[PDB]
Amino acid sequence: MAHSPPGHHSVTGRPSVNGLALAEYVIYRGEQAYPEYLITYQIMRPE
Amino acid sequence: GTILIDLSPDDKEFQSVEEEMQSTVREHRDGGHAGGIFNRYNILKIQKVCNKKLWERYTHRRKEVSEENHNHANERMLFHGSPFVNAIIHKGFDERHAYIGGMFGAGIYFAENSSKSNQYVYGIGGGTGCPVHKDRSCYICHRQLLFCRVTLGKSFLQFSA
Ligand SMILES: O=c1[nH]c(-c2ccc3n[nH]cc3c2)nc2ccccc12
Ligand SMILES: [Zn+2]
């Protein structure tokens, strides 16, 4: 893995074209996330 | 060390996690190529992931980050999709779970949009789709996402397409 930018713990990817997109985030240390919920699902075919 | 506890659909915790999953679906610029064509999910199960060692690893790091950032962990709840979700829940996140070729460098990527993480369930770009039918838009096969607690601390803001 890379390092975070100096003086930062993560990167925020702010969407700047698609006005409907929400943010995406990057961490560089595995210890900075805990997998709290496991969700089992199907995608649904639109009507 | 990991145990999985089923949540009941009647539990407020199941309901609030389902709502986050459903309400953060969006359309994607690939027309559904990677993740499939859908507006919503059929949630089959939600389980709490309980691992004392992994939790302590997380909270230890959270305190370090917090003390470097005026007592602010900047903790978020975010989605993660990966072919390795079964390894993550048993061993935690590490360098093997990084997106080496990601837009923001080799790190572990998380999304606010559940449908963004859904694009990675079968690999980068949806890989070859589901194991059974090789269909990235499979409506039959069962998928898994993680809804994760993530410490951002001081986050570097990247404006981007
Ligand atoms: O949930 C995500 N997983 C992944 C992901 C997960 C595991 C991977 N292994 N190799 C590449 C990966 C990408 N990338 C994302 C990028 C942006 C937003 C969310 C995600
Ligand atoms: Zn399938």
Curated annotation (Swiss-Prot), chain B:
Coiled-coil region(s): none
Domain PARP catalytic: from-to ranges: 8-161
Post-translational modification remark: Ubiquitinated at 'Lys-48' and 'Lys-63' by RNF146 when auto-poly-ADP-ribosylated; this leads to degradation. Deubiquitinated by USP25; leading to stabilization.
Tissue: Highly expressed in placenta, skeletal muscle, liver, brain, kidney, heart, thymus, spinal cord, lung, peripheral blood leukocytes, pancreas, lymph nodes, spleen, prostate, testis, ovary, small intestine, colon, mammary gland, breast and breast carcinoma, and in common-type meningioma. Highly expressed in fetal liver, heart and brain.
UniProt: Zn(2+) binding residues: 130, 133, 138, 141
Effect of residue 103 to V: Loss of activity
Compartment(s): Cytoplasm; Golgi apparatus membrane; Nucleus; Chromosome, Telomere
Tree of life domain: Eukaryota
Family: Belongs to the ARTD/PARP family.
Task performed by this protein: Poly-ADP-ribosyltransferase involved in various processes such as Wnt signaling pathway, telomere length and vesicle trafficking. Acts as an activator of the Wnt signaling pathway by mediating poly-ADP-ribosylation of AXIN1 and AXIN2, 2 key components of the beta-catenin destruction complex: poly-ADP-ribosylated target proteins are recognized by RNF146, which mediates their ubiquitination and subsequent degradation. Also mediates poly-ADP-ribosylation of BLZF1 and CASC3, followed by recruitment of RNF146 and subsequent ubiquitination.
Subunit composition and interactions: Oligomerizes and associates with TNKS. Interacts with the cytoplasmic domain of LNPEP/Otase in SLC2A4/GLUT4-vesicles. Binds to the N-terminus of Grb14 and TRF1 with its ankyrin repeat region. Interacts with HIF1AN. Interacts with RNF146; this interaction leads to ubiquitination and proteasomal degradation. Interacts with NUMA1.
Record protein name field: Poly [ADP-ribose] polymerase tankyrase-2
Protein's gene: TNKS2
